[PDB]
Amino acid sequence: NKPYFTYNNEIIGEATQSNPLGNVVRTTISFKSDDKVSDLISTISKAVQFHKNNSASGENVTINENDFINQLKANGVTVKTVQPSNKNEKAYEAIDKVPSTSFNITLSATGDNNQTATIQIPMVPQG
C-alpha cells in the first residue's frame, strides 16, 4: 500500500534488493548553459506526481530549489545568479557551466504513515 511517484503518468518502481536502480526514471532532462533553474524545475514538476498511498490521486511534487541547486553543484554544475541591470528587473539563477557526465537528481516525498518514496531523474548536460 506504499506511496509512489509517477513520471508522465507512468508508475515508477521502488529500489528493490534485486534491482537497486528500480526507482531510476526512464527519462532524461537536458540542461545547458543559461538555462533558468526555474525552467528545469518546472519541466520536472510538470512530469512528476506523488501519491501519498497506493490508491491516492496524484499531487504535485514541490521541489526545494536550494536542495535542487545543491544537487546540481555536487554533480559538477556551476550556477550563476544573473544580476538585474536595474531595480525594475529581478535576479534569477541559471546554469553557468555544465559537466561532461550525466548524473541523477533524487526526489523524495513522505506519504501516509511516514512512508517515504524516492525516485532518481537522470540529468543530461548539453555542452
UniProtKB/TrEMBL annotation:
This is SlpX. GO terms for molecular function: metal ion binding. Keywords: Calcium, Metal-binding, Signal, Zinc. It comes from the Bacteria. The keyword RNA-binding does not apply. The gene is slpX.
